[PDB]
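@channel anyone free to eyeball this complex?
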Amino acid sequence: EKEEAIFRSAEMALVQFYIPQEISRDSAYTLGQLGLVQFRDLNSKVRAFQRTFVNEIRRLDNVERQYRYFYSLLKKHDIKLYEGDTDKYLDGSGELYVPPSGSVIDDYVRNASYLEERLIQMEDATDQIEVQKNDLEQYRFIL
Amino acid sequence: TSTTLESELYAIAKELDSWFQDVTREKAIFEILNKSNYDTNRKILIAEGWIPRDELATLQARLGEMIARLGIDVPSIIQVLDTNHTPPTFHRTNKFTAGFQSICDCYGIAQYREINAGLPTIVTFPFMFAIMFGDMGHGFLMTLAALSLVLNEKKINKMKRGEIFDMAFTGRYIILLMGVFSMYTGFLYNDIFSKTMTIFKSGWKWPDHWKKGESITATSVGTYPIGLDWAWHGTENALLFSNSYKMKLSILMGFIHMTYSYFFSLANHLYFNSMIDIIGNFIPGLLFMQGIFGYLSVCIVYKWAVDWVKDGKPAPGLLNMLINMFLSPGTIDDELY
Amino acid sequence: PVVSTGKAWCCTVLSAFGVVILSVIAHLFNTNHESFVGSINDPEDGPAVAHTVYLAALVYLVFFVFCGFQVYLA
Amino acid sequence: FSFSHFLYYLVLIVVIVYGLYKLFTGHGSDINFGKFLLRTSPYMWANLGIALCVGLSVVGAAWGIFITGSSMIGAGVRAPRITTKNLISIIFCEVVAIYGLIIAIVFSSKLTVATAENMYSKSNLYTGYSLFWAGITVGASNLICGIAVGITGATAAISDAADSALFVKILVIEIFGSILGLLGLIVGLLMAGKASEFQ
Amino acid sequence: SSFYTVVGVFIVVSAMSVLFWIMAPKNNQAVWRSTVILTLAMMFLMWAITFLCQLHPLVAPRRSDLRPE
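replying in thread with the prediction:
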């Protein structure tokens, strides 16, 4: 029994959540797997760097930035991205997947941070060769 | 030297998308926890959120499943709050009323519990299309183009298209209703590929004999049941009838549309307990525009209903008397009633 | 003979409309409708133009059955 | 240099010398501006009135439409929510051509056919003069109104792209400037009020 | 004057619309209930405008050329 809400809007409620800290990270996944809560901003008039959970944004978008550097490096040396088609073990019926817990996120962070400088020096090594391919080849045209 | 790099990129290029999805989800979780109050005397996060009323039984079920997955004891993490803020809108769409809702939401997102304008749009939008697109065969081609998109819905919602086929596919029921209503309108205009039909007997009768080249007239032996008569096809004054015909059609349909949309304001003001808005805005505007422009529509229909040649009275001009109603009051050249 | 698939539908659909439309117009030339020939202008004879419009409908039919089997190969 | 001013000065000198010569002969009444108004067909004046009415109304509408449309397209690059809001500033410039349509539909019901006898009667010359001047009155008023409403629409689009609270206060000026075409409409209907058909 | 033809078909269409108001299925109640009752009305009104002003016409066709048969 759900109202149709095509003649008018749907009737709303404002619900206050009392979430403990030790299950907060875990509970926000369940709140996100059901897509029917719009959160309002309670921390207004607080600056963007003064808020809580800012280093947990800086680490994660550093990982985002290194993934962007990787995908920029994939377009050169043409390799198709795999795009794993199963967008259904996160979506779909059940509405319940277990989120990866802590050590998996730390593995992602240190894996990307180890992988970046390795790819940087491997790319810098193969571009000192091209800049001395170029002058030798055009000198061969001169000769 | 450019081979081990490439093999490393072959290793990275597989299973990078799943890494990216996991990190974007992890970042979105903290972006949602960022806007919640943090307490220090006890380790409790306080968060507020809007929700429709039919899912308070869904919240408790899903959060009960979560607290049954991990063994704890928490005291009733859900509390419905009484507020004075402005809640969101949320109309439900179900695949047929979705495209018209996306039409009406492109102009503006409606007020909370206001009457949705996407519900009458479903039929009043393709019909006002159809009046301008009054052809049998062109509406038939439009229905064929629409059924080429409706009859395979499952094949198309899994592809990447770009900005033109998107507007083609998300409005397929719009194109279907436009084509069907254009079939009905082009039937009433008696027009298929700019030709007539001859599916009934005519209301006009040609004379008995004429020389090849004589300008003759028809003699009005009845009326034609559905549509325009096919005795207006060549006839060298077809525009003289058709223009004064369809202009009055457009004025009548526009007035009925405006006076139907105006009553939704009364159904709003009666719902929000706003009885000063009725007596201050509904009645003045209703009397002002009915007593000017619905009187014109009543006069158009009344001039249609009266036989002027049999009564021997001159047929007046409705445009002339509409002008002289304001620019010279009291003086009437030809009497109507 | 490079691809020849995106131009097969453009001719099969064209011929599929053309057969039906010229067939019904030729049938309306044959029985004198007095709206296709009911004035002093363009046709005078009657079925003598119904002849060549049915001929053009046959030519559209062989366009349709030629190009309708080339799209079948994909 | 300045070829257009040379044309204007040459036309001025030729007209002055010609009129002064028609004085010089003693035949200054051969330049008879009034006999030209009698002996000219009234349907020319009526059809110039109708055609110049609808043409000048459409020109003013197009002018206002691209003035507000260029600024609204330019201002919607950073703030794309101005388009569906300031649609009404293009509505206000488009109704000008509809006023011209209404005038053309009213005036074209008076273009009947007259007899060779009493062709240049008092009523027919009156009808030609009234339709000509009423048509160019409403057409020039529609032109000017479309230009002004377009300028105010461009400025309103810029100000609403600044922040959302300003377009209610600038739309009032468009409401002021859009009444002028309706004034031209009313007086164009009133100038041709007592003119009959051509009989 | 046979304006009563328009009146009688209006009675029939209004009666079947009131019959559909107490008949429409309970799944998408307002969608059926509004779309059908608002399309019957407009499909009636356009035909009723069409049947009028062809009832007592003031202008007859001409057709100068028209082969004498």
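from a first look: Chain D has one domain: 7-192.
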